[PDB]
């Protein structure tokens, strides 16, 4: 992503243009590695939900002796 260098150091002005990263044959669409790594915030939310569900399941398994 590329914006004005005049207003880059002042604020965040959005994205007005794109420049090419590496040369490839027309379409190609080489997959990015970052799309196969989960973001940290989603992992922390899912970790909290999953460990709370496991704690309640462990309490139910202790209480019901199952």
């Amino acid at each position: 992503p590329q914006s004005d260098l005049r207003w880059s150091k002042q604020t965040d002005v959005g994205i007005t243009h794109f420049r090419s990263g590496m040369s490839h044959e027309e379409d190609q669409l080489i997959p990015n590695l970052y799309r196969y790594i989960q973001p940290w915030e989603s992992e922390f939310i899912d970790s909290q939900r999953v460990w709370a569900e496991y704690a309640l399941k462990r309490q139910e398994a202790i209480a019901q002796n199952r």
Binding site: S8, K9, Q10, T11, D12
Partner: protein, 67 residues
């Protein structure tokens, strides 16, 4: 206690130093001040280190990665 919890709100608010962490040798301290405590601390620091020409801006450092 655990890492960033207290027993009570009154135990939190009893001191300016709210949060503290040490990562081997790195130190991260979070203070919360009222107006009077900050004014008294500024008065004591200017009592030891006077600066009438306001040169404290010049030696101060800032995060240049941000806009």
């Amino acid at each position: 206690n655990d890492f960033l919890s207290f027993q009570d709100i009154a135990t939190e608010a009893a001191h300016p130093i709210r949060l503290f962490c040490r990562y081997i040798d790195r130190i991260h301290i979070f203070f919360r001040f009222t107006a009077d405590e900050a004014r008294d601390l500024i008065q004591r620091y200017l009592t030891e280190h006077p600066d009438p020409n306001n040169e404290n801006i010049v030696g101060y450092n800032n995060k240049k990665c941000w806009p």
